[PDB]
Design a protein around this ligand. Structure first.
Ligand SMILES: *[C@@H]1O[C@H](CO)[C@@H](O)[C@H](O)[C@H]1NC(C)=O
Ligand SMILES: *[C@@H]1O[C@H](CO)[C@@H](O)[C@H](O)[C@H]1NC(C)=O
Lengths: 50, 50
């Protein structure tokens, strides 16, 4: 498996450090493991960052 | 000192949703660096310990 390294979210998003972690993502399948509203915020930030 | 101050409401009547700024207050407690203490200098680690 061509597995990209594990992106870890420690705290709430600042759009300073988590933005860099989202810019490191260049693979195809993104596996997300969080709650519901956190998934809503992560998908909204991914839509805002393209 | 920070903004977006929310409060946990009266959960027994009409309030079943959780307090949404939980990880915000958790990030405040994790980043709480101190120089004061009678027993000694206390500072939270990445697990929130001494
Ligand atoms: C405070 O909350 C509002 C509404 O959710 C949001 O637009 C704003 O960005 C928040 N403040 C900061 C500094 O993030
Ligand atoms: C341990 O004791 C020494 C006694 O001088 C004190 O200076 C030090 O702050 C203590 N360690 C901590 C950080 O609890």
């Amino acid at each position: 498996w061509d597995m990209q390294n594990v992106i870890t979210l420690d705290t709430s998003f600042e759009d300073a450090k988590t933005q860099v972690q989202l810019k490191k993502i260049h693979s195809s399948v993104i596996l997300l493991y969080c709650s519901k509203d956190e998934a809503v915020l992560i998908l909204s930030e991914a839509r805002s960052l393209g | 000192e920070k903004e977006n101050i929310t409060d946990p409401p009266r959960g027994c009547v009409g309030n079943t949703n959780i307090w949404k700024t939980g990880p915000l207050f958790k990030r405040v407690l994790m980043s709480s660096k101190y120089a004061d203490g009678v027993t000694g200098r206390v500072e939270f680690n990445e697990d929130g310990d001494r």
